[PDB]
Assembly symmetry: C3
Homo-oligomer: 70 residues x 3
């Protein structure tokens, strides 16, 4: 349960980076295809950014707790 939580965290991290990459691709599609590009997507961007930040801190939080144990 020691190395278990560590791999859970690492999996969560990878999924995080995945998610960020899909966000980038979807943004590129808006930019390339839509006549107004990323215009009007501002609020969707803010919601995405808020959850990425929240995710990033929790990750950091988990990392800290883990090594406080170690």
């Amino acid at each position: 349960i020691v190395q278990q939580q560590n791999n859970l965290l690492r999996a969560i991290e990878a999924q995080q980076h995945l998610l960020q990459l899909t966000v980038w691709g979807i943004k590129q599609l808006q930019a390339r295809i839509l006549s107004g590009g990323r215009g009007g997507w501002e609020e969707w961007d803010k919601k995405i950014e808020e959850l990425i930040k929240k995710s990033e801190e929790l990750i950091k939080k988990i990392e800290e707790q883990i090594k406080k144990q170690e």
Copy 2:
């Protein structure tokens, strides 16, 4: 390992909401760009919906188990 599992769950949740937001954006792209909009995407929608539901229940399940401990 107490507050560890709780932050893992919360991270999983955030990623969940992220994922839902990317799904929304991809659906908007289908709707706005494709001549037939979201037409023909029905099965992809069903697969997405099935995994979101599965995810949501597991989250709930984790939450319950956690506080049954508390």
Copy 3:
């Protein structure tokens, strides 16, 4: 904490499959809409593929550790 880690893993898995499905949808959008289709996306594809593989192994790793306990 026994059945807790197991549901965390399963949630992570579901999110994984979700993520793969969004990747598929974004690839279909590139293919259908862009004049050059998926052309020029090769590096983005490689980054995605690298993180999916990493994710898949960690999942497998978690599964193994879990039942080594059981």
